[PDB]
Amino acid sequence: SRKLILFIVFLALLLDNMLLTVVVPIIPSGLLFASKATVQLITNPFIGLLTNRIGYPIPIFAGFCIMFVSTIMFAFSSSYAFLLIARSLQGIGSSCSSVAGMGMLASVYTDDEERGNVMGIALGGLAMGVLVGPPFGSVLYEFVGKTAPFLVLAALVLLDGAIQLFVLQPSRVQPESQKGTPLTTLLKDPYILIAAGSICFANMGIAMLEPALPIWMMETMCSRKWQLGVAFLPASISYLIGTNIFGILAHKMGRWLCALLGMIIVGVSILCIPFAKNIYGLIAPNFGVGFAIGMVDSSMMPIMGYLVDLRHVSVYGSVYAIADVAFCMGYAIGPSAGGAIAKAIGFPWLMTIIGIIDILFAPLCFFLRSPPA
């Protein structure tokens, strides 16, 4: 049925982010950090144009064979080249599983109201993956061994792939009934660009904040190392709550208004992080940041599907490749550019710049109220 497709997409995204986040703490044991995101950004539009040619089931199932190969390559690698190869393979997989899975979800839940909350649930998949990533990784790392986290995650990826092969049955190539509108015509749409830009700036704010916040906490607050890991918890829990609630709330409120308010709340929250003196001062603003990132993503993915349905041809592979490029731009240029700006003009000014950009971008979501057909 359809809820099994939703579960498959949720599980793919959850395992993808659990791997992406267990790799972080164990990696130490610069380019490697941005490698996955940039390779996924490169191979997003290709998958977008491919799902319209072979269908959704096959490029979503290749996303389990690529993520499984990446996972096992992480557990038995020592060299730096091999870790880079593993992270690039994870990037290609994630591209396959995010783009093809969101396309499948939009193709199956073909109703504007239902698509909202199923996108919300699939997105909360990423929050549940990031949130349960580090603890699982650590406990399995030290209580069993250094190859343990990745081999157990590989077993989980295999079980998810078994569910995939039993639900989707990717045996045969099935092209779409109608040829989807080209990628350039989509990219010339002022509304698809506004949606992608709102997702891009929200996630770039959060992706520049995550790595820059610990480097500032150890300098201003004299925080211990456990504090650095705990100070970012409100973001993930709040993103989980925000996505799961606003998938259902945004269509009653209006997706344009939910996106506008999410942008303004991300802006204000990020403008209000540098004013915190102690760790208890980074609970409320980080909560606001994560809550509003969810408020924006759970409102702007269904809108992507809707904007394609209303104006262009009903093929969702490319437009969700565009949405996933907007996602990945932030996580690719986040660490590097954020560290560069913080190393040059400081962390408070970086946060003020990001907040100003988000607040000034917010009024552009007004143009999503009633776009013409």
Ligand X SMILES: NCCc1ccc(O)c(O)c1
Q: Report the binding-site residues.
A: 126, 130, 203, 206, 210, 232, 239, 297, 331
Task: Annotate 317-348 with b (16+ C-beta within 10 A) or e (fewer).
Answer: bbbbbbbbbbbbbbbbbbbeebbebbeeeebe
The nearer residue to ligand X, 75 or 264, going by C-beta atoms, is 264
Whole-number Cα distances in Å, 336 to 16, 20, 30, 202, 215: 22, 17, 8, 17, 13
| Residue closer to ligand X, measured from CB, 64 or 287 | 287
Closer residue to ligand X (CB): 181 or 238 = 238
In the complex, least distance from residue 127 CB atom to ligand X, rounded to whole angstroms: 5
Specify the amino acid at residue 186.
L
> What is the closest distance, in whole angstroms, from the C-beta atom of residue 20 to ligand X in the complex?
10
Cα distances from 295 to residues 232, 281, 320, in angstroms, run 18, 22, 18
Q: Are 259 and 368 in contact (CB under 8 A)?
A: yes
Closest separation in Å from C-beta 30 to ligand X? 19
Smallest distance from ligand X to CB 73, Å = 24
Which is it for the CA torsion 18, 59, 121, 273, positive or negative? positive
**Closest distance of CB 14 from ligand X, Å:** 12
Query: Among residues 160 and 324, whose Cβ is nearest to ligand X?
Result: 324
Which residues, at least 6 apart from 323, have a Cβ–Cβ distance to it below 8 Å?
102, 195, 196, 199, 300, 301, 304
Rounded to a whole number of angstroms, the minimum distance from the CB of residue 237 to ligand X is 9
Question: Which residue's CB is nearer to ligand X, number 239 or number 361?
Answer: 239
DSSP at 139: H
- Site of tokens 């690039």: 88
Query: Cβ neighbours of residue 41 under 8 Å, at least 6 residues apart?
Result: 325, 328, 329, 332
CB nearer ligand X, residue 127 or residue 341:
127
Contact residues toward ligand X (CB under 6 A) are 126-127, 130, 203, 206, 210, 235-236, 239, 290, 293, 297
303 or 315: CB nearest ligand X: 303
Give me the least distance between CB of 293 and ligand X, in Å please: 5
Cα–Cα distance measured from residue 186 to residue 177, given in angstroms and rounded to the nearest whole number: 19
The minimum distance between CB 238 and ligand X, in angstroms, equals 8
Give the span between the Cα atoms of 210 and 192, in whole angstroms: 27
- Bind-site residues for serotonin: 126, 130, 203, 206, 210, 232, 239, 297, 331
The one-character DSSP state at 182 is P
The encoded tokens of residue 187 equal 């990219």
DSSP classification of residue 372: -
Please report, for residues 15, 55, 86, 108, 325, the alpha-carbon distance to residue 58 in angstroms, rounded to integers and kept in the order given: 19, 6, 22, 16, 21
Q: Which two tokens stand for residue 363?
A: 């009024």
Sequence letter at residue 221: M
Q: Which of 19, 130 has the CB closer to ligand X?
A: 130
